[PDB]
């Protein structure tokens, strides 16, 4: 579309690769550093989609 269709999403970060045919979605907050990210996002805490 001219204005851009933004209803298609794909993951960016994941700790481990997924085995064949794994489908069940998940939208938690992926932590980057050893500091445990909880709830909201910030430094070294990114949305994975």
């Amino acid at each position, epitope marked *: 579309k001219v204005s851009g269709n933004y209803n298609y999403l794909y993951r960016l*970060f994941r700790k481990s690769n997924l085995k064949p045919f794994e489908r069940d979605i998940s939208t938690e907050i992926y932590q*980057a*550093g050893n*500091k445990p990210c909880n709830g909201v996002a910030g*430094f070294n805490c*990114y949305f994975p989609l």
Partner: antibody
Amino acid sequence: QMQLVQSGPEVKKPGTSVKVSCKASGFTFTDVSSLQWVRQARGQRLEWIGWTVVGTGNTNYAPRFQERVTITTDKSTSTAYMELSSLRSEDTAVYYCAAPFCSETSCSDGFDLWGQGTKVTVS
Amino acid sequence: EIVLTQSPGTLSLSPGDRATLSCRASQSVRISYLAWYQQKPGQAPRLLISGSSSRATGIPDRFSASGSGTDFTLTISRLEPEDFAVYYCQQYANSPWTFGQGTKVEV
């Protein structure tokens, strides 16, 4: 080595546009690495401008520099650009970009890589 | 918008002793989102301490960070002549980040 290099000083007339870019040598920004930009005047403190995430593309800006500065990232060369317009006399300072090393898995909670900054002056 | 204040304004202690500096904020604080930086004259600042237990490459054991509440402190076991520089406190967790004001340590 794995390290970040910065451009050189320059003098720009007021009421014009200024572009700044800092490079990385032997180091890629992958999808998790992020970097921030800071400015240091002469005999002054440090003020934070903004930091962006290479992967998601989210950007953050200081409230007083909401329109003055625009920050962008480049995956192809793994670098960061700033564009500024109508520079004033207080802008004559040294600009640094600081990032932590990070390789697709995890990384430190502090900025340990640093450049040497660009000395920008207005005359 | 959180403001960071460092104390004392200046430090004048002879080399070979233990030194202490402090920085405090106003809003809420987190243990591992505060970092301490030093800046040599004419050189860009380099990471010293972050998270109160982590260290950068080649950081000597003399550096230490203390504090759990709003007030945080930096302790130096043994000073050496060219360690004299300006120290800055930086925060991550809160609203758009702000640095400190700088503390000059001298003889």
